Amino acid sequence: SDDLSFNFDKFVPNQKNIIFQGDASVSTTGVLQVTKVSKPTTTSIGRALYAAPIQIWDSITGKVASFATSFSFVVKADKSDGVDGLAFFLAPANSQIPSGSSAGMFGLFSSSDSKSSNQIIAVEFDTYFGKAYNPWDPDFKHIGIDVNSIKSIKTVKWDWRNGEVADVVITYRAPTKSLTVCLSYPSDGTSNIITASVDLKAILPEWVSVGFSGGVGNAAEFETHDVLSWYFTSNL
Amino acid sequence: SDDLSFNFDKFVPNQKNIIFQGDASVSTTGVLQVTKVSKPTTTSIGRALYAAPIQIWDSITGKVASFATSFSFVVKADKSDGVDGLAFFLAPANSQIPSGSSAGMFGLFSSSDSKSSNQIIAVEFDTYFGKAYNPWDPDFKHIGIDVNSIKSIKTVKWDWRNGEVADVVITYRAPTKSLTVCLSYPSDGTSNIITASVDLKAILPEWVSVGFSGGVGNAAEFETHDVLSWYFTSNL
Amino acid sequence: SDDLSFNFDKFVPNQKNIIFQGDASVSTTGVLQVTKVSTTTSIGRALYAAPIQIWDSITGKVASFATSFSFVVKADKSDGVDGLAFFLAPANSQIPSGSSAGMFGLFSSSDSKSSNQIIAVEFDTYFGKAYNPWDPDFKHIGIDVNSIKSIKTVKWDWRNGEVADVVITYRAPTKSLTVCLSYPSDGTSNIITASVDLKAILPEWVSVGFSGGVGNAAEFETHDVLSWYFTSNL
Amino acid sequence: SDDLSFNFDKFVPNQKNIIFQGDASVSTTGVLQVTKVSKPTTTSIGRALYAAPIQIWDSITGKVASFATSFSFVVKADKSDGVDGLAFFLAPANSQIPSGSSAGMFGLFSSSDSKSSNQIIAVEFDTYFGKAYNPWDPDFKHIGIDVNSIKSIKTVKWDWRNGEVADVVITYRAPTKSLTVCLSYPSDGTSNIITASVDLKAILPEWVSVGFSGGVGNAAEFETHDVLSWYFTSNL
Ligand SMILES: C[C@@H]1O[C@@H](O[C@H]2[C@H](O[C@H]3[C@H](O)[C@@H](O)[C@H](O)O[C@@H]3CO)O[C@H](CO)[C@H](O)[C@@H]2O)[C@@H](O)[C@H](O)[C@@H]1O
Ligand SMILES: C[C@@H]1O[C@@H](O[C@@H]2[C@@H](O)[C@@H](O)[C@@H](CO)O[C@H]2O)[C@@H](O)[C@H](O)[C@@H]1O
Ligand SMILES: C[C@@H]1O[C@@H](O[C@@H]2[C@@H](O)[C@@H](O)[C@@H](CO)O[C@H]2O)[C@@H](O)[C@H](O)[C@@H]1O
Ligand SMILES: C[C@@H]1O[C@@H](O[C@@H]2[C@@H](O)[C@@H](O)[C@@H](CO)O[C@H]2O)[C@@H](O)[C@H](O)[C@@H]1O
Ligand SMILES: *[C@@H]1O[C@H](CO)[C@@H](O)[C@H](O)[C@H]1NC(C)=O
Ligand SMILES: *[C@@H]1O[C@H](CO)[C@@H](O)[C@H](O)[C@H]1NC(C)=O
Ligand SMILES: *[C@@H]1O[C@H](CO)[C@@H](O)[C@H](O)[C@H]1NC(C)=O
Ligand SMILES: *[C@@H]1O[C@H](CO)[C@@H](O)[C@H](O)[C@H]1NC(C)=O
Ligand SMILES: [Ca+2]
Ligand SMILES: [Ca+2]
Ligand SMILES: [Ca+2]
Ligand SMILES: [Ca+2]
Ligand SMILES: [Mn+2]
Ligand SMILES: [Mn+2]
Ligand SMILES: [Mn+2]
Ligand SMILES: [Mn+2]
Numbered sequence: 001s002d003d004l005s006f007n008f009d010k011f012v013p014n015q016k017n018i019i020f021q022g023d024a025s026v027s028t029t030g031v032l033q034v035t036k037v038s039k040p041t042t043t044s045i046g047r048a049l050y051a052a053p054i055q056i057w058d059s060i061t062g063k064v065a066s067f068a069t070s071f072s073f074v075v076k077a078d079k080s081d082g083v084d085g086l087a088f089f090l091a092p093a094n095s096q097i098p099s100g101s102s103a104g105m106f107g108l109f110s111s112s113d114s115k116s117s118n119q120i121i122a123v124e125f126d127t128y129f130g131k132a133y134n135p136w137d138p139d140f141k142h143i144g145i146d147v148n149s150i151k152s153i154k155t156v157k158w159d160w161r162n163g164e165v166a167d168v169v170i171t172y173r174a175p176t177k178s179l180t181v182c183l184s185y186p187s188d189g190t191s192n193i194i195t196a197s198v199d200l201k202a203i204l205p206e207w208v209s210v211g212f213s214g215g216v217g218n219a220a221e222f223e224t225h226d227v228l229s230w231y232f233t234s235n236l
Numbered sequence: 237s238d239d240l241s242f243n244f245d246k247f248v249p250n251q252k253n254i255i256f257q258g259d260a261s262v263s264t265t266g267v268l269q270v271t272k273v274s275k276p277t278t279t280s281i282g283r284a285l286y287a288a289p290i291q292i293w294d295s296i297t298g299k300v301a302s303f304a305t306s307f308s309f310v311v312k313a314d315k316s317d318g319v320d321g322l323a324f325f326l327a328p329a330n331s332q333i334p335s336g337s338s339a340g341m342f343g344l345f346s347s348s349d350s351k352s353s354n355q356i357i358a359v360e361f362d363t364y365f366g367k368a369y370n371p372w373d374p375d376f377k378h379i380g381i382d383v384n385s386i387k388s389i390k391t392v393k394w395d396w397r398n399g400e401v402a403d404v405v406i407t408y409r410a411p412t413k414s415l416t417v418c419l420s421y422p423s424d425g426t427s428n429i430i431t432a433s434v435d436l437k438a439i440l441p442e443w444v445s446v447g448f449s450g451g452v453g454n455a456a457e458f459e460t461h462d463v464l465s466w467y468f469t470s471n472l
Numbered sequence: 473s474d475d476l477s478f479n480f481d482k483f484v485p486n487q488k489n490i491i492f493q494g495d496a497s498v499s500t501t502g503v504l505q506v507t508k509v510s511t512t513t514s515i516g517r518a519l520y521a522a523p524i525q526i527w528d529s530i531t532g533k534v535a536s537f538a539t540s541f542s543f544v545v546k547a548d549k550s551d552g553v554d555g556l557a558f559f560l561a562p563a564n565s566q567i568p569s570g571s572s573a574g575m576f577g578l579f580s581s582s583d584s585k586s587s588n589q590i591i592a593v594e595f596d597t598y599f600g601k602a603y604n605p606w607d608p609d610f611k612h613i614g615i616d617v618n619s620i621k622s623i624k625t626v627k628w629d630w631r632n633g634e635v636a637d638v639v640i641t642y643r644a645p646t647k648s649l650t651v652c653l654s655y656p657s658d659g660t661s662n663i664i665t666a667s668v669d670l671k672a673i674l675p676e677w678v679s680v681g682f683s684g685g686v687g688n689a690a691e692f693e694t695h696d697v698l699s700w701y702f703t704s705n706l
Numbered sequence: 707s708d709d710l711s712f713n714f715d716k717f718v719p720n721q722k723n724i725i726f727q728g729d730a731s732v733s734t735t736g737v738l739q740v741t742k743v744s745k746p747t748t749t750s751i752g753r754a755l756y757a758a759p760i761q762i763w764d765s766i767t768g769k770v771a772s773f774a775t776s777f778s779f780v781v782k783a784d785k786s787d788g789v790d791g792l793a794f795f796l797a798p799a800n801s802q803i804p805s806g807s808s809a810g811m812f813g814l815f816s817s818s819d820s821k822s823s824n825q826i827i828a829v830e831f832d833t834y835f836g837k838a839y840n841p842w843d844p845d846f847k848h849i850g851i852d853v854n855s856i857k858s859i860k861t862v863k864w865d866w867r868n869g870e871v872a873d874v875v876i877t878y879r880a881p882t883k884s885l886t887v888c889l890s891y892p893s894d895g896t897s898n899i900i901t902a903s904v905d906l907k908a909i910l911p912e913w914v915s916v917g918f919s920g921g922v923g924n925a926a927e928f929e930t931h932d933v934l935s936w937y938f939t940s941n942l
Contacts, residue, residue: 004712005710093722287522288522637879639886652875
C-alpha cells in the first residue's frame with residue numbers, strides 16, 4: 001500500500017507517538033491543546049509532531065510524495081475575538097522551536113523574513129491580523145499557505161466561527177504540485193477553500209516532520225487551539 | 237479496514253467493473269467520456285456506475301456509512317460555452333436511466349418535481365442555466381447538491397475553466413450529516429467549495445449504486461464531460 | 473492506493489454486492505452458508521458482485537492479492553462431505569452444467585481442460601476412492617488449477633465445528649500462492665505454497681468468491697464463511 | 707481507518723524513520739542488514755525499530771490492538787551452516803539493547819531467565835541450537851514464539867533454505883489472542899507455520915516499539931540476516 005498512513009480519533013494524555021514542544025499537551029478529555037488553556041490565561045506557544053519522520057521526496061529516484069490529511073479543530077475565544085492562530089506544517093525532521101519565536105509566528109519562524117533555510121511549509125488559520133504587530137497579514141481572519149515565511153504566498157478570508165468545530169481536508173497532489181485546503185463548519189454549512197502551487201522538492205529536505213503549532217500572543221485576548229482528531233497519509 | 241475502497245488511475249476500454257448506461261464509454265486514451273464525443277456532434281445522455289452496490293446504511297444496527305470520493309474531470313467546450321453538465325450520484329442499487337430523461341436532468345430524473353420516490357442524491361456541475369429550458373437553475377454556472385430533485389437544495393457559483401482539469405473531493409461525515417464538495421483547478425488555483433446537511437438514511441435505500449452521469453442537450457453547444465480518475469471509499 | 477479492497481465483518485440477508493448461485497445464501501445470524509443447511513444434497517457459490525482485473529494485456533502487469541476469511545465446517549456425525557473452496561473464475565461465471573458436489577460447482581468434469589480457467593483453493597473433506605479417485609488419502613487443502621485434481625495438497629487437520637482463520641496471499645513477482653490456515657481454538661495450523669502464473673491461466677477480468685457442496689445428504693456438514701477481507705493491486 | 711499502517715518496499719541508507727541499534731544498518735542496495743556483513747567477518751548484534759511507538763492496548767477502554775506484519779528476509783551462510791538467527795519483536799517503547807546481551811539472545815535478553823519485567827514478545831528464526839551454548843533451544847533450526855524469555859513457549863522445525871528469500875506473514879487477532887506465523891519460500895514451495903495464544907495486555911506495556919533484531923555469535927560460522935521489505939499495520 002502507501003508509504004504511511006495513521007489515524008487518531010482521539011488523543012490520550014502523554015501519547016508516546018506525538019512529540020510535544022512548548023506548551024502543547026493533551027487534556028484528559030482526549031483533545032490536543034496545542035496552546036495552553038489554564039486557570040489564569042497566559043501567553044503561550046506550542047507544537048505537536050508525529051514521532052516519526054516522513055520521506056517527502058527521494059533524491060535517488062526523483063519521486064515526490066503526495067499526501068492528504070484531515071483534522072477537526074476548535075478555536076474558542078472568551079471575548080468575541082482571540083489570538084493568534086493554529087497551523088499545520090511540514091518542517092525538517094525532528095525540528096525544534098526556533099529561538100525567539102513569536103506567537104504570531106506560530107513557533108515556526110525566528111523572524112519575519114523569507115529565508116530559504118527555514119524549510120517550512122505550513123497552512124495557517126490566522127485569527128489575529130493587527131497592523132501594529134502583524135504587518136504582513138491581510139485585513140481579516142484568514143487561511144494562508146506559508147512557504148519559508150510568515151507572509152503567506154496566498155490567503156483567503158476565513159469565516160471563523162467561535163467555539164464551533166471545523167473540518168479540514170488538505171491534499172497535495174505531487175504531479176500537479178497542487179496544495180488544496182478544504183475547510184467547513186458542519187454547524188451552519190460555512191465553507192472556505194484555497195489552492196496554491198508548491199514544489200516540495202524545492203523547499204523541503206528529503207525527510208520531514210509533520211504536525212500542528214499555534215500561539216497566544218496576548219493573554220488578554222485568549223482563545224483555544226484544540227485539535228480533536230487527525231488523519232494523515234503520504235505516498236512516494 | 238473499511239467496508240469498501242477502490243481506485244481507478246485510468247480507465248480501460250470496456251472496463252468490466254463499470255456499468256455503462258446511455259452513451260457513456262471509455263476512449264482508447266483511458267478516459268471515461270460519460271457524454272459521447274464525435275466528429276459530427278450529437279445530443280447525448282450517459283451514466284457510468286461501479287458494478288457492485290454499496291451498503292450506505294444498515295436497518296439492523298441503524299449505522300449510516302461515511303464516504304469520501306475523489307476524481308478529476310474536464311469539460312471542454314468548442315465555443316466559449318457548453319451544455320449541460322456532469323454529476324456524481326448515489327441512486328438505488330443497479331438503477332437504470334429514467335424514461336424520458338432530459339440532458340438538463342443529467343439522466344437522473346423523469347421530471348422536474350421533488351418526488352420522494354426518486355431516491356437520488358447527486359452533486360451536479362451544471363454548465364447550462366438558461367431560464368427558457370432550465371427554470372430551476374440559478375443565474376450562473378454552478379455546483380449543486382441535489383436531493384430527489386433537479387432543483388438543488390444549495391448551490392454555489394462554479395468558476396468553470398474551459399478545457400482545464402478540475403480536482404474534486406467529496407466527503408460525507410455520517411455523524412454530522414455533513415456533505416462537503418471541494419473543487420479546485422491546479423492550473424490557476426481557482427477553488428470552489430460547498431457544504432450541506434443531508435441525511436442519507438432518510439433519502440436513500442439500504443443498498444445504493446454510485447457513479448457519474450451527464451448530458452448534452454443541444455448538439456450546437458457541445459462540450460465534453462470526461463472523468464480522468466476516480467477514488468472512492470465508504471465505511472459503516 | 474490499491475486497485476481494490478473490501479471487507480465484510482458479517483453478512484446481511486440478501487447482501488446486494490454478493491451474487492448468489494445455487495443454494496448459497498446468508499442466514500439471519502449474518503453468516504454466509506455457501507451450502508444449504510436444513511436436509512439435502514446441495515451446491516452453492518457466492519461471488520463478489522464486481523469483476524476484478526487480475527492482469528493487464530496493455531502493460532503486462534499481473535495483480536498481487538491477499539484475502540482473509542474465517543469459516544466453520546460442522547458435521548452431524550464425525551465426518552462430512554464435501555468441502556469448501558475459494559476461487560477465481562472468468563468474470564460473472566455461472567455454475568457449470570452437470571457439476572458434482574465433489575467438484576464444488578466449479579467443474580463440468582474431472583479433466584484438466586485449459587478452457588476451464590479456474591484457480592481455486594479447496595478445503596476437501598471427502599476423499600473416498602469410489603467417487604473422488606483424484607483426491608489423496610486424507611482431508612486436505614489443495615491448490616486447483618483448471619482441474620479438480622489439485623496440483624499440490626497438504627493434510628488438513630480439520631476440527632469439527634471449530635472456526636478456522638485463513639489467509640491467502642499471491643505475490644505476483646514470484647508467482648507464489650500461499651495458504652495459511654489456523655484454528656485459534658487449539659493452535660492447529662496448516663500451510664501450503666505453490667507456483668501459479670495467473671496470466672497463463674485466467675482471463676484479464678475475473679470474479680472471486682466461495683463455492684462448496686454436499687454430495688450425500690446422509691453425511692451432512694455446513695460450509696459457513698463468517699467474514700471476508702480481500703484486496704488486489706496491479 | 708486503522709490506527710497505523712506503514713510499508714517499506716526497500717530501505718534507504720540512513721532511513722530516518724528507523725532507529726538503528728548495534729551493528730544494524732541498510733546497505734546501498736537498499737537492504738536492512740540487521741547483522742553486520744563485512745570482510746573479514748566479525749561477531750555482531752543489531753536491532754532496527756520503527757521510529758514511532760505504537761499503542762498496543764488501552765488502559766482507559768481495555769481495548770487490545772490486532773496487528774499484522776509482512777516481511778521478506780534472507781539468511782545466507784558461507785558454509786552449510788550459520789548462526790545465530792533473526793527475530794521480529796515488540797518491546798517497551800524506545801527500548802535499548804540490554805546490557806551484556808548474547809547473539810544467541812538476539813540482543814533482546816540480559817539473561818536466560820523468564821523475568822516478567824523483560825516485557826518482550828518476539829518471533830525468532832533460530833539457526834543455532836547447540837546444547838553447549840544454547841541449552842534452551844530444541845534439536846533443530848526453528849521458528850519460535852518468545853514471551854519474556856529466550857526459551858520459546860512453542861517452536862516448530864524451520865526448513866531453512868540457504869540464501870533463499872523467505873516470505874513471512876505474522877497476524878495477531880486480539881479477540882482470540884491468536885498469534886500466527888506464516889513462512890514460505892517461493893523458490894521451492896517450502897512452508898512452515900506456527901500458532902500460539904498470547905495475551906499482549908498481560909505481557910506488554912501500553913506503548914511498544916516494533917522491529918527486528920539478530921546476531922552472529924561466532925564469526926567463523928557467519929551468515930547474513932537481511933530483511934528486504936516490511937509491511938505493518940495495527941488497530942485498536
Ligand atoms: C556463552 C554463549 O555465547 C554465545 O554462544 C555462541 C557461541 O559463542 C561462544 C564461541 O563459540 C566461543 O568461541 C567463545 O569462546 O565463547 C562464546 C560464548 O562465550 O558460538 C556459537 C558458534 O560456534 C554460537 O554463535 C553460539 O550462539 C551465546 O549465543 C549464548 O547465548 C551464550 O551466551
Ligand atoms: C512583538 C510581537 O509580539 C506578538 O504580537 C502579539 C499579537 O500576535 C497579538 O497577540 C496581540 C494582541 O493584542 O499582542 C501582540 O503582542 C507576536 O505575535 C508578534 O509576532 C511580535 O513578536
Ligand atoms: C425542454 C428542455 O429541453 C432541454 O433543455 C436544453 C438545455 O438543457 C440546453 O441543452 C439548451 C442549449 O441551448 O437546449 C435546451 O433544449 C432539457 O435539458 C430541459 O430539461 C428541458 O426538458
Ligand atoms: C452420485 C455421486 O454424487 C456425489 O458423490 C458423493 C460424494 O461426494 C460423497 O458425498 C459420498 C459420500 O458417501 O456420496 C456421493 O454421493 C458426486 O460428487 C459424484 O460425482 C457423483 O455424482
Ligand atoms: C532563529 O532560529 C535559528 C535557530 O537555529 C537561529 O540560528 C537564529 O539565530 C534565530 N534567530 C535569532 C534572531 O537569533
Ligand atoms: C420517470 O422515471 C421512472 C423510472 O423508473 C418511471 O417510473 C416514471 O414512469 C417516469 N416518468 C414517466 C412520465 O414515465
Ligand atoms: C461443462 O460446462 C460447460 C458450461 O459452459 C459446457 O460447455 C459443457 O457442455 C459442460 N459439460 C457437459 C458434459 O455438458
Ligand atoms: C540486563 O539488562 C538490563 C539493562 O537495563 C540491566 O538492568 C540488567 O542489569 C542486565 N543484566 C545484567 C546481568 O547486568
Ligand atoms: Ca497573525
Ligand atoms: Ca442545468
Ligand atoms: Ca473431494
Ligand atoms: Ca539459538
Ligand atoms: Mn497570516
Ligand atoms: Mn442546477
Ligand atoms: Mn481434493
Ligand atoms: Mn530458540
